[PDB]
Amino acid sequence: YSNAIVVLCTAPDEASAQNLAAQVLGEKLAACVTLLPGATSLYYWEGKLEQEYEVQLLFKSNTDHQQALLTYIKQHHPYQTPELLVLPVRDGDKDYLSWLNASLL
Amino acid sequence: YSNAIVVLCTAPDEASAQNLAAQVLGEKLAACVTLLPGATSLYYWEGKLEQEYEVQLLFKSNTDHQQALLTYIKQHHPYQTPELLVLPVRDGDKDYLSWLNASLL
Amino acid sequence: YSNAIVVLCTAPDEASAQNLAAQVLGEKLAACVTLLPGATSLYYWEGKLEQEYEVQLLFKSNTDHQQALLTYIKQHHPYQTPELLVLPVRDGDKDYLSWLNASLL
Numbered sequence: 207y208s209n210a211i212v213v214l215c216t217a218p219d220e221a222s223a224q225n226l227a228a229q230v231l232g233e234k235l236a237a238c239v240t241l242l243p244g245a246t247s248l249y250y251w252e253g254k255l256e257q258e259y260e261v262q263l264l265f266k267s268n269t270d271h272q273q274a275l276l277t278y279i280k281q282h283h284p285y286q287t288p289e290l291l292v293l294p295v296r297d298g299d300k301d302y303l304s305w306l307n308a309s310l311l
Numbered sequence: 312y313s314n315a316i317v318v319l320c321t322a323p324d325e326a327s328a329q330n331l332a333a334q335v336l337g338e339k340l341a342a343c344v345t346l347l348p349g350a351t352s353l354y355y356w357e358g359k360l361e362q363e364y365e366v367q368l369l370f371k372s373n374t375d376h377q378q379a380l381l382t383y384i385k386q387h388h389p390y391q392t393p394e395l396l397v398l399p400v401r402d403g404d405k406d407y408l409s410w411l412n413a414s415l416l
Numbered sequence: 417y418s419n420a421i422v423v424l425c426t427a428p429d430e431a432s433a434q435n436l437a438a439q440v441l442g443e444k445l446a447a448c449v450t451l452l453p454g455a456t457s458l459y460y461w462e463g464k465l466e467q468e469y470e471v472q473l474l475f476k477s478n479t480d481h482q483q484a485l486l487t488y489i490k491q492h493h494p495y496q497t498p499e500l501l502v503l504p505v506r507d508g509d510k511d512y513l514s515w516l517n518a519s520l521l
């Protein structure tokens with residue numbers, strides 16, 4: 207396995223998604239943050255089935271910066287309990303991983 | 312590795328995607344279902360290259376509910392052979408994982 | 417773990433993403449390619465924070481064709497150093513996995 211990771215997270219709108227991405231990148235806690243706006247999420251919250259528009263984010267980072275990234279997002283997110291799921295990366299293109307690794311703190 | 316999983320699946324349109332998600336959620340087989348509408352999928356089917364609009368779904372659940380979820384979607388999907396790929400989750404925010412686990416059957 | 421994989425990659429626009437997908441599929445190096453257009457990616461490039469539109473791609477393939485797929489994309493991509501991250505697949509629907517494998521043999 208490579209040391210790269212892809213962290214999934216959602217935001218209520220593009221404005222908040224962009225602000226969070228900019229903060230994370232300025233702190234060098236991710237190499238690239240990709241936003242997928244216009245998503246819809248369904249889930250139960252306090253006993254009711256909700257259906258809300260959200261932005262699905264993908265934070266591309268590495269294991270050496272994993273906890274710092276999670277902690278940062280958790281403390282700079284509009285939601286109290288944001289989605290934060292780390293996907294492992296089994297392999298990647300050498301040159302891309304090189305760039306990803308070099309971009310981080 | 313945490314016990315969380317993210318299941319990839321596609322649906323032909325938002326209406327079918329929403330119905331499936333609502334059903335899975337009511338059955339408590341996923342904690343959150345995110346729909347990414349307006350995607351385009353290319354693939355060969357019966358020897359012909361097809362290019363079709365689809366909704367990419369992400370079902371956020373755990374390994375304990377993995378088989379029931381897969382079986383449920385398979386039996387309640389518009390396609391005869393739907394995409395069902397389980398991505399493992401290496402780690403996550405504990406508060407989020409706690410809510411995810413608590414929302415399941 | 418199954419032998420399936422999901423490879424993340426981004427393209428600058430739909431035209432280029434579609435051409436790449438078609439080429440990869442003709443070469444039988446992926447069973448299905450899903451395009452998520454209208455995404456926004458933020459990243460530092462040459463010291464400056466960029467915010468650009470991209471298409472997020474998901475190549476659904478197997479470990480048996482993983483290196484050939486990565487090499488092929490790298491040689492047929494508009495970017496000099498494109499994003500190429502391989503996500504492992506823990507499990508999936510038997511019929512879907514069978515179709516994916518058969519499509520590439």
Ligand code: NA
Nearest residue numbers: 220221224225
């Ligand atoms: Na803006």
Ligand code: NA
Nearest residue numbers: 220221224225
């Ligand atoms: Na902004």
Ligand code: NA
Nearest residue numbers: 243244349454
């Ligand atoms: Na869209």
Ligand code: NA
Nearest residue numbers: 325326329330
């Ligand atoms: Na609906």
Ligand code: NA
Nearest residue numbers: 430431434435
């Ligand atoms: Na095209």
Ligand code: NA
Nearest residue numbers: 443444520521
């Ligand atoms: Na052959």
